[PDB]
With several copies, the nearest count.
Chain A
Amino acid sequence: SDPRRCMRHHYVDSISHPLYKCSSKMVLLARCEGHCSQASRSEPLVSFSTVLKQPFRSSCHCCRPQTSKLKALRLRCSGGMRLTATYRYILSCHCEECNS
């Protein structure tokens, strides 16, 4: 129960179309936040090519959504236009590697 820990946080926002003028609809959401425990690093790599790239291998545990259910909803825009928006409710956070 460490508040630092990577974890799910709850809050409400109101989705409204960026460009079109529309009525906002208030919905609840979740986000991932904390400090993954596992230290990070990168260390150098060796190439016998005349071409390198390959500069280093690194590891780093970010904190990200383990499990997320898609949602969506429709919006009524001034004049005819009625619109649909889609996003991801986040059921679970975990710490995973930044590059896979």
Chain B
Amino acid sequence: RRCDPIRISMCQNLGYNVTKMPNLVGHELQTDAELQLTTFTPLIQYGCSSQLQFFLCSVYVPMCTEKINIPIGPCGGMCLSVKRRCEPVLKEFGFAWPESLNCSKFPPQNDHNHMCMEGPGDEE
């Protein structure tokens, strides 16, 4: 009911069924978010990190649940573990690491107080 189904194939079939717009970034519609991801598609191929794609989906189509009205995204540690692997390569393609993926914003860990997903890649 409350949440809504993922419509991006790319992000389909990871941990979780469902998300809710509007985006953490502030995307209004999955389609638009779809557009952004595509841009990262070459990077994904390069396979800087295995966990990359999942992470991005986490940000762009955050998990959602009927249990509570807030959205669920990635913990920092995960991103960092990711960020380090790909910060450079993105520098190739002459690309700054985007502020939207600023790893300060994400909570440190997963707890009652704050809920975010983690991966085997980790950090403080």
Q: A25-B112, A89-B110 are in contact. Are A1 and B13 (CB under 8 A)?
A: yes
Task: Let me know if B15 and A28 touch, CB within 8 A.
Answer: no
Cα–Cα, bound, A28→B13 (Å): 19
How many chain A residues touch B (Cβ–Cβ < 8 Å)?
Answer: 22
Q: Which residues of A contact B117 (CB under 8 A)?
A: 10, 28, 30
Which residues of chain B (35-49) have a CB below 8 Å from chain A? Answer: none
Chain A residues near B61: list those with CB within 8 A. Answer: none
Q: Which residues of A28-66 are within 8 A (CB) of B?
A: 28, 30
Check: B115 CB closer than 8 A to any chain A CB: yes
Per-residue B-contact encoding for A58-100, CB less than 8 Å = 1, 0 else: 0000000001010101000000000000000101100000000
Partner of B15, one of A10, A13, A14, A71: A10
**A28 and B120 form a contact (CB under 8 A):** no
Given A8-B15, A91-B119, A91-B120: A73 touches B63 (CB 8 Å cut-off): no
User: What residues on A are CB-neighbors of B110 within 8 Å?
Assistant: 27-28, 71, 89
Residues of chain A within 8 A (CB-CB) of B119 are 91
Distance from A86 Cβ to chain B, minimum over Cβ atoms (Å): 13
B-side contacts of A14, CB under 8 Å? 67
Q: How many A-B residue pairs have CB under 8 A?
A: 49
Query: Nearest Cβ in chain B — how far from A33, in angstroms?
Result: 10
Q: How far is the CA of A25 from the CA of B45 in the complex (A)?
A: 40
Chain A residues whose C-beta falls within 8 Å of the C-beta of B63 in the assembled complex: 10
- CB of A18 within 8 A of chain B? no
How many angstroms from the CA of A71 to the CA of B16 in the assembled complex?
A: 21
Say yes or no: is B118 at the interface (Cβ < 8 Å to chain A): yes
Listed in ascending order, the chain B residues whose CB lies under 8 Å from chain A are 12-13, 15-16, 63, 65, 67-68, 72, 110-112, 115-120
The 24 listed contacts between A and B (C-beta, < 8 Å) are: A1-B12, A10-B16, A10-B63, A10-B72, A10-B117, A12-B68, A12-B72, A13-B67, A25-B112, A26-B68, A26-B115, A27-B111, A27-B115, A28-B72, A28-B115, A28-B116, A28-B117, A67-B120, A71-B111, A73-B111, A89-B110, A91-B118, A91-B120, A92-B120
